[PDB]
Scaffold this active site. Structure first.
Site, PDB file in Angstrom:
ATOM      1  N   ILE A  56     -57.178   8.142  75.051  1.00 34.16           N
ATOM      2  CA  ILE A  56     -56.489   8.769  76.613  1.00 34.16           C
ATOM      3  C   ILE A  56     -56.263   8.028  77.747  1.00 34.16           C
ATOM      4  CG2 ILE A  56     -57.644  10.515  75.749  1.00 34.16           C
ATOM      5  CD1 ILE A  56     -60.450  10.699  77.261  1.00 34.16           C
ATOM      6  N   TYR A  82     -57.389  16.529  77.825  1.00 34.31           N
ATOM      7  CA  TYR A  82     -57.305  17.005  76.405  1.00 34.31           C
ATOM      8  C   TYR A  82     -57.309  18.677  77.250  1.00 34.31           C
ATOM      9  CZ  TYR A  82     -57.748  14.097  73.035  1.00 34.31           C
ATOM     10  OH  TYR A  82     -58.157  13.470  71.403  1.00 34.31           O
ATOM     11  N   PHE A  99     -68.399   9.729  78.544  1.00 36.38           N
ATOM     12  CA  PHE A  99     -68.451   8.743  77.531  1.00 36.38           C
ATOM     13  C   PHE A  99     -69.636   7.690  77.745  1.00 36.38           C
ATOM     14  CE2 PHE A  99     -64.498  10.701  77.359  1.00 36.38           C
ATOM     15  CZ  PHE A  99     -64.194  10.960  76.041  1.00 36.38           C
TER      16      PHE A  99
END
Length: 107
Positions: A56, A82, A99
């Site tokens: 991404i 997303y 993350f």
């Protein structure tokens, strides 16, 4: 909207560039929610290169702003990964991603 919060140690100068394949012990995390992914589970730490739009946009921009040995903490906005669609069953639409990223790479 990538916001780096680096846990200090590393070298701070080996910067990722184009044509470079790098290795990340990543770990996904949903904000106000549980886990969804961990490269530490399979013990195969996800060899990947830079610039081919594999990952991404939020993880790609956060990868270039790091160095070897560092330990970051991403915060991906919904629009870069997303948030319009959402990955079916795994990632709901309009979600904000967390993350744990550690870069121990080559090249």
């Amino acid at each position: 909207g990538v916001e780096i919060e680096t846990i200090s140690p590393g070298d701070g100068r080996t910067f990722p560039k184009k044509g470079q394949t790098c290795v990340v012990h990543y770990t996904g995390m949903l904000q106000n929610g549980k886990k969804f992914d961990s490269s530490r589970d399979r013990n195969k730490p996800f060899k990947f290169r830079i610039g081919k739009q594999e990952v991404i946009k939020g993880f790609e921009e956060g990868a270039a702003q790091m160095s070897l040995g560092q330990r970051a903490k991403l915060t991906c906005t919904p629009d870069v990964a997303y948030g319009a669609t959402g990955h079916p069953g795994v990632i709901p639409p309009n979600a904000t991603l967390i993350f744990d990223v550690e870069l121990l790479n080559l090249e």
